[PDB]
Symmetry: C3
Subunit: 151 residues, 3 copies
């Protein structure tokens, strides 16, 4: 079968006076992510992995905003290109806040947006062990991998 893999990366700065939204979950926090749309770093990384697996370019090609609506439209285009999504895995790298209590809700949001069962979606969290701009809490990064199959 015609399997394809995709990978994605995103990072945004953390700034005061923005809500913190990751994987579609609003997380109580004194800072939020700054950037394109609601700056949901995890959903953007996943979106890039899916477009990448389908060889449809990247998120900026498609979407010159609720990042869940963008993920759903990404999933629609990937399906229209003839691909079915098989699984998604991902990592969020953040010094803070603690993400564990929110991870299951993120997984559920992604699963809903991709029309996948929960057991085909995974979200992992890491600190950066105090190193670099991530260790200093200046931003949050997300990484994603996706497997799709054509037809």
């Amino acid at each position: 079968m015609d399997f394809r893999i995709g990978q994605g990366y995103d990072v945004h700065q953390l700034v005061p006076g923005r809500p913190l939204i990751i994987g579609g979950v609003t997380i109580p926090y004194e800072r939020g992510l700054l950037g394109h749309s609601d700056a949901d770093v995890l959903l953007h990384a996943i979106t890039d992995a899916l477009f990448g697996a389908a060889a449809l370019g990247d998120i900026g090609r498609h979407f010159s905003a609720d990042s869940r609506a963008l993920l759903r439209e990404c999933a629609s285009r990937v399906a229209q290109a003839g691909f079915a999504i098989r699984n998604v895995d991902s990592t969020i790298i953040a010094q803070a806040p603690k993400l564990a209590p929110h991870i299951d809700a993120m997984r559920a949001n992604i699963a809903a947006d991709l029309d996948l069962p929960l057991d085909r979606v995974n979200v992992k969290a890491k600190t950066n062990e105090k190193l670099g701009y991530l260790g200093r809490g200046e931003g949050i990064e997300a990484q994603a991998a996706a497997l799709v199959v054509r037809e």
Copy 2:
């Protein structure tokens, strides 16, 4: 044909007074990795990729400070336990690939031993396990030798 992919990331600080252990191999060096267990950044990244591919969460969700089974366990015991939980969930491991990013020391003479260790721990043939090494071209905290990063990718099938 129910294939799944997983990806893993880890980084630890390099500190004096600790052995450098990567892929289960003790490498001569004036500093070693600081962290959970023996801070084996490569085995941790692989562990997370495998949990990821099986949609089992992550290393921190499985292995706590609170668990007497894993108190002071080295990263190879954890990797073996990861493999156990992946099998328990109905998955077989097909291959692992990885990259260690370290400005220093030279990892080349140690790579095949790392591969051998991982293959043994995962019950895989050598030809389904790969480890690569990169410097960071003196950029950032990696380039300054403040820490070492590892990245991993894993394919499994249910």
Copy 3:
């Protein structure tokens, strides 16, 4: 069937005085990448992902007969070794992280070079671009990073 995955990473410093070559494409810019070969960070990452999927070690283990060889030559040789190991390449995806210059205009050219070198249909090759949102050495324009993923199948 006998699928395998691979992943690749590369980074090079960005300095005045060298041409900027990414994915085989010369891109007009005041600065260029410094490093192994012609420092094509994207082709190097892809090469590493392919050797990784085939469990053949890494680019430095493979590449004397290669002094002065440019990265497309290296990619092509990589592709040959992957095939002789029994693997057919199914797809490649990748991301370039560069604060500047704008890479979008050059993406099709990169994809075309990579697909040619790998003997792949164009629709099995993808290249994405990201800024680093002004964070870190990448965000300050001190270097450019590439990440790659490759899927292969034995026979």
